[PDB]
Structures are given as C-alpha cells and as structure tokens.
Amino acid sequence: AVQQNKPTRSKRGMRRSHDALTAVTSLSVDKTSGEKHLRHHITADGYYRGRKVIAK
Amino acid sequence: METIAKHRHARSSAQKVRLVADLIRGKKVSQALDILTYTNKKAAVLVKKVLESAIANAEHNDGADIDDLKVTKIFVDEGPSMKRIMPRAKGRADRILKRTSHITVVVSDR
RNA sequence: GACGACGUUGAUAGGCCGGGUGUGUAAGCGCAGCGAUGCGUUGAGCUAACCGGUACUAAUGAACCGUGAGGCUUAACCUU
RNA sequence: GUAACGGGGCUAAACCAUGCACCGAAGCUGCGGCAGCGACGCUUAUGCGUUGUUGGGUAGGGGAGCGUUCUGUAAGCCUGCGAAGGUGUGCUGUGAGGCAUGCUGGAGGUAUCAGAAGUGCGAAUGCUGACAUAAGUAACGAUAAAGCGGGUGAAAAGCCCGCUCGCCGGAAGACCAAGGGUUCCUGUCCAACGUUAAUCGGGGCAGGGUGAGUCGACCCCUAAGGCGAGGCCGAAAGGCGU
RNA sequence: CCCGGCGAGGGGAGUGAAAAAGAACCUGAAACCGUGUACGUACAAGCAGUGGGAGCACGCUUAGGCGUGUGACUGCGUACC
RNA sequence: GGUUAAGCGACUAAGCGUACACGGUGGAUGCCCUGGCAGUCAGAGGCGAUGAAGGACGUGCUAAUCUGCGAUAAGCGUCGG
Numbered sequence: 001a002v003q004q005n006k007p008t009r010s011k012r013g014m015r016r017s018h019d020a021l022t023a024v025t026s027l028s029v030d031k032t033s034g035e036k037h038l039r040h041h042i043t044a045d046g047y048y049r050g051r052k053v054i055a056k
Numbered sequence: 057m058e059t060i061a062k063h064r065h066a067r068s069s070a071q072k073v074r075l076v077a078d079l080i081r082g083k084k085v086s087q088a089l090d091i092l093t094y095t096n097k098k099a100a101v102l103v104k105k106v107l108e109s110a111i112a113n114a115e116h117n118d119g120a121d122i123d124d125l126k127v128t129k130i131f132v133d134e135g136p137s138m139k140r141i142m143p144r145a146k147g148r149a150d151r152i153l154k155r156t157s158h159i160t161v162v163v164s165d166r
Numbered sequence: 167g168a169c170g171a172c173g174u175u176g177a178u179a180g181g182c183c184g185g186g187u188g189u190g191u192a193a194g195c196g197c198a199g200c201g202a203u204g205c206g207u208u209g210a211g212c213u214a215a216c217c218g219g220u221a222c223u224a225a226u227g228a229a230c231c232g233u234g235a236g237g238c239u240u241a242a243c244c245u246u
Numbered sequence: 247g248u249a250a251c252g253g254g255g256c257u258a259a260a261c262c263a264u265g266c267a268c269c270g271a272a273g274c275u276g277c278g279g280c281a282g283c284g285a286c287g288c289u290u291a292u293g294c295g296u297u298g299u300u301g302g303g304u305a306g307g308g309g310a311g312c313g314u315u316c317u318g319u320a321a322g323c324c325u326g327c328g329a330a331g332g333u334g335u336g337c338u339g340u341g342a343g344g345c346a347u348g349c350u351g352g353a354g355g356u357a358u359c360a361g362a363a364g365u366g367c368g369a370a371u372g373c374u375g376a377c378a379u380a381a382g383u384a385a386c387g388a389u390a391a392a393g394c395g396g397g398u399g400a401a402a403a404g405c406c407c408g409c410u411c412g413c414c415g416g417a418a419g420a421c422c423a424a425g426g427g428u429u430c431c432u433g434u435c436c437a438a439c440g441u442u443a444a445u446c447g448g449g450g451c452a453g454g455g456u457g458a459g460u461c462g463a464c465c466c467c468u469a470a471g472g473c474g475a476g477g478c479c480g481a482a483a484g485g486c487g488u
Numbered sequence: 489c490c491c492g493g494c495g496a497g498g499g500g501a502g503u504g505a506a507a508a509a510g511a512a513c514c515u516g517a518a519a520c521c522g523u524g525u526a527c528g529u530a531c532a533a534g535c536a537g538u539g540g541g542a543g544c545a546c547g548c549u550u551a552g553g554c555g556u557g558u559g560a561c562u563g564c565g566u567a568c569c
Numbered sequence: 570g571g572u573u574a575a576g577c578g579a580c581u582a583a584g585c586g587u588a589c590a591c592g593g594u595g596g597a598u599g600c601c602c603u604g605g606c607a608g609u610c611a612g613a614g615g616c617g618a619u620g621a622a623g624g625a626c627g628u629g630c631u632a633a634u635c636u637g638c639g640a641u642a643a644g645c646g647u648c649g650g
Contacts (some may be wrong), residue, residue, distance in 0.1 A: 025230050025231080026228090026229045026230045028227095028229075029229085031226085031227075039228095039229090040226085049227095
C-alpha cells in the first residue's frame with residue numbers, strides 16, 4: 001500500500017524520460033492568402049485552399 | 057551582446073513550465089514563435105509573452121536586428137509557495153501548496 | 167501505443183439509388199351505421215449496424231526526417 | 247530445482263606406508279619512527295649515552311591536554327592601505343587543532359600569564375521552523391441535461407439579451423419568529439478568496455438606503471420560579487422565609 | 489522612454505561610496521531544485537567502499553614520465569545505536 | 570589496384586552518475602539596542618458618598634486607530650519660569 005524506502009532522485013528522472021512532448025514537424029502555406037496554418041485547418045483570416053470560406 | 061527578460065512570481069509549477077522551455081532551446085526567434093503559437097498548453101502563453109518582451113528590448117536598448125537573434129539560454133526556477141488548508145473527512149485537515157516559478161529568457165546575436 | 171486498408175491516376179467513411187429483412191393493411195378521401203366501429207383504395211406505410219452499385223461531400227500542391235560508394239590485418243583469387 | 251566432494255572434473259586429482267622440496271597469518275627475523283615502567287652513570291631545576299623489558303580491550307579506576315563565551319593585564323596592541331562572519335587554496339602537529347593567503351563582506355577584534363562557566367550532540371515514537379518522497383498519481387461534493395445565434399472584452403462551455411429543451415410545484419414557490427449583523431441597491435476593479443476560466447459574485451474599494459397616535463417593544467396585570475426590610479436559624483462564609 | 493490587458497512582471501536612463509543596498513530591502517550558511525562544460529555508462533547481478541589499474545581531458549614541464557578531474561577491468565568486503 | 574572469404578574493431582545517450590563554474594529557494598551565523606532580569610542608597614506606604622479601582626459613548630479643518638480631554642470636551646482662568 002505504501003513504500004518501505006524513499007526512492008532516489010535518479011529513479012524519479014528515469015520514470016520521467018517519456019514525458020517529453022513533441023513539436024509540430026511543419027505547417028502549410030495558403031495558396032492565395034499566403035499565411036501559415038495547420039494542415040487541413042482554416043486559416044486565421046478565414047481562407048482555405050484559396051476559397052475564402054466564411055470569415056465571420 | 058545579450059538581452060534578458062524575466063517574469064517572476066508566475067502562477068505555475070516549475071515542472072509544468074519546463075516542458076515548454078525545452079522545446080525552443082537553441083532555436084531562432086522566428087522559428088521559436090511559430091512553435092509556441094501551435095502548442096496547446098497554458099505555459100506556452102506565459103513563455104511566448106516573455107520571449108516577445110526580450111526581442112523588443114534588443115532593438116530599443118541595443119539596436120539589434122530580428123534576423124540575427126536566437127534563444128541562447130532559457131531556464132526556469134522555483135519561487136515561493138502559498139500555504140492553504142483543505143478539510144478532509146472525520147475532522148482531519150490537510151495542507152495545500154500553490155507553487156510559483158521564475159522564467160528567464162536570454163537572446164543574443166550569436 | 168501498436169497492427170491492417172485508403173487519399174482524386176481514388177469506393178476509405180457518410181449521404182444517395184436499387185434489393186433484402188422486420189413489423190402487419192399509414193395518412194387523406196369515399197361508402198355502411200343513431201353511435202362506438204367496420205369495409206374499399208392496400209400486404210399499405212415506415213424500416214438501425216446487412217447485400218449489390220454510385221465521386222454528390224470530405225480525404226490539397228507542398229513541407230519535414232533520412233545522404234553523397236562505405237575501417238584495418240592476413241590468405242586464396244582478378245593475374246588456377 | 248541437480249541439492250549427502252563447495253564447482254569442473256578425476257581411475258588418480260582415491261586409500262595405506264616411506265622420503266625430499268615448495269606454498270601458507272597482523273606469529274618470528276630484518277630496516278626506520280613514537281611512548282610507559284625498571285634498575286645504572288649519584289646524573290641532575292633533567293635530558294641523555296646508554297641499558298633491559300613492555301604497549302588487544304567492555305563495566306570501571308588513575309594520568310595529561312585541545313577549543314568556545316565572559317573578567318583583569320588593556321586609555322596597551324591590530325584595523326576603512328579593510329575587523330567579525332561566509333566560501334576556496336597551500337603548509338603543519340601523535341590527536342582534539344593551529345598558521346598564512348585569494349574572493350565575498352563593510353566595523354569591530356584581541357596576544358601573553360591568571361580567573362569564572364547556561365562550555366562541545368546523530369539517536370530519547372525529543373522540541374520549533376524550513377524543505378523532500380509517494381506524483382503531476384487520487385479527487386474536483388447527489389446521474390434534474392443541455393443546444394445554437396447576437397453583444398461586451400486582451401481572452402467567452404460558465405457573464406448579459408433572444409429562441410428551443412429538461413427539472414420542482416403540501417415545494418426546490420410565498421411571508422415570519424429564533425439566530426446572524428450590512429450579506430440589501432448603484433458605480434468601479436480581478437492580486438488573494440470561488441476546488442477550473444472569469445468581463446461574473448454573498449470577494450476588494452467608494453457612495454446611497456430602514457419615515458408609524460392604530461404593527462411590535464416599552465407600558466398595566468399575573469403563572470412556574472427568583473430576590474427579599476424586620477424576623478427565625480447557623481464556627482465565619484451563609485441558609486430559609488413574612 | 490520601451491514590451492504588456494491605461495495589468496502583474498521586466499529592460500534602459502537617473503540618484504548614491506555601494507541598487508548582486510529597490511522597499512518580498514545589512515550580512516545571506518545547510519537541506520532541497522535547475523542551466524553549462526570534462527570524463528564514464530544500454531551482455532551485466534548484492535551496505536556502493538577499499539587495494540591494484542588502462543584509456544581520455546587539462547595544467548605544468550630546460551620532453552623531467554609529476555599535479556588535478558573522471559574510473560573500463562580485477563582481489564577483499566552483509567550500515568549505525 | 571579489383572572481387573570473395575576469415576579474424577578483429579572506434580564513432581550512438583532516450584536518460585542517469587561524479588567533479589567544477591554560475592543561479593533559485595530558505596533565513597542560520599556575525600554585528601546592533603528606546604525591551605527585559607537581579608540588586609544598592611533614598612522616597613512614599615494608601616484611594617473612596619466632595620462619588621473610587623475599572624469601563625461605555627463622545628470630543629479635531631478629520632474616514633480609521635492610539636494618546637489627551639469631558640457638551641467650557643488634544644481644552645478655560647490666575648500666579649511664576
């Protein structure tokens with residue numbers, strides 16, 4: 001139920017070796033607006049594949 | 057030449073913030089800003105704010121250029137903690153800690 | 167986490183078309199009866215995960231990682 | 247789980263008798279150093295030339311020392327040309343220790359020989375403060391339930407407005423006593439407080455709000471019971487009662 | 489004066505002998521938590537040290553084969569009260 | 570120099586350990602005293618129905634608390650310094 005000995009700081013780091021997160025490898029560029037956006041996502045200005053989706 | 061910006065007494069544990077900090081170490085400022093924009097963490101907003109301030113300081117005080125800057129150093133330090141009381145069952149009381157941290161960003165033309 | 171299929175030079179998922187299956191004669195209108203109801207149109211209407219088909223909708227051009235002929239010694243071979 | 251030579255493995259690497267070599271301890275010898283106790287040189291305020299011999303150790307007895315704070319010596323001596331304290335390096339004694347010096351620090355420190363003690367910490371489920379571990383794990387308090395448009399804003403699943411959906415309805419609606427004591431209304435702010443965010447709040451700050459001859463209290467009258475002039479009783483205090 | 493939400497918190501300028509004396513303020517030790525550099529570590533079993541010891545890095549040196557950090561491999565070794 | 574075969578063999582660090590340099594957290598140590606402790610030599614040994622000890626509420630150019638004061642309310646008359 002509870003520990004019998006105090007784990008060391010070395011053990012704590014070992015368990016934490018899989019906690020690192022990964023950044024986005026790359027992001028797309030719109031064909032018409034020219035701004036950067038996530039792939040398969042709407043741009044900040046409301047463009048998508050140079051079609052000018054609703055930007056309300 | 058090196059420029060420094062800090063944010064002290066931030067409401068977040070050092071362990072949580074350190075995850076974001078390791079993501080942009082050694083990268084260029086232009087690339088670093090893009091990475092922080094598309095990270096879904098609260099600490100990303102805090103770190104991005106500090107990095108922008110450091111960039112502004114370079115131009116006004118040192119007259120540097122954006123194209124030549126990169127994140128030379130970055131680290132997070134623990135700050136003071138706040139003590140609180142949380143009632144539990146059967147009349148027992150517990151202690152709660154609300155940790156803070158210090159964020160430092162160094163940008164240089166190296 | 168992993169593993170398998172597919173991304174327009176395309177049937178991967180939804181929708182749509184036809185069929186099957188289940189339930190058991192819809193609504194509207196007409197007729198008989200004082201009325202509750204019955205009868206005709208009618209095995210009618212509706213129908214999830216199933217079967218056979220179909221580019222109507224979504225699967226974007228790119229970008230990123232990974233390189234540039236691959237150590238030394240000895241023997242037999244190229245030149246048994 | 248081989249499990250009745252420690253293991254390989256051995257027909258000698260087994261057993262009996264005889265002989266000669268070698269390995270093997272902090273035992274013995276060789277070389278250098280320290281200390282205790284004896285006798286001798288009658289040396290010597292005692293150290294030696296010598297000279298023999300001894301030196302594991304709990305309870306416990308005997309002998310000799312280091313360092314810390316305070317008083318005299320001290321109206322002395324060191325110090326802004328850098329004191330105490332903190333942190334490194336070099337040298338030195340058998341030990342507790344001592345000496346010099348770089349950096350930090352920015353005003354006190356103290357020889358020698360004597361004197362006096364709140365004089366030395368790892369343990370007592372010791373006392374007070376600070377910080378770890380489990381761990382970014384459990385949990386976020388009734389399974390009555392939410393969806394979308396517009397507005398404000400640095401930022402909206404939670405705030406404001408509108409249209410739908412769901413729940414209580416002898417209450418989860420309305421008015422009071424007891425108790426609490428500004429939580430009531432308006433403007434403004436988001437650090438802390440709210441188990442998340444917050445532009446919102448019973449949160450922070452400032453201003454405003456409670457109008458009685460008839461409602462209630464006070465007031466007149468008494469129940470249980472309390473107090474009680476004289477009085478009766480009891481060491482004192484005090485008890486009962488008209 | 490500049491970044492930020494007319495924020496919080498910072499970077500310059502200025503004052504002062506000193507701002508690493510900035511109001512969370514003299515001196516600023518330890519536990520505990522981080523960034524940078526050198527060396528070691530993914531076929532090896534146990535109080536983590538001790539004796540021996542290769543290689544690498546670095547400072548010296550009239551190469552004087554020494555000093556400092558690290559420690560592959562190997563003998564012995566079951567904390568304290 | 571080429572092909573094949575056999576033997577041998579550096580460069581990896583997701584993370585971790587030791588040493589050194591520079592920081593964070595925390596408030597020990599040194600220095601400091603308008604506070605305490607123990608005495609000596611002198612005082613005075615009581616206050617109150619002429620309303621006490623101790624309190625409530627008020628009082629300023631004044632929102633709060635402390636000190637003083639009492640509707641004559643951080644004060645009034647007189648005699649001296």
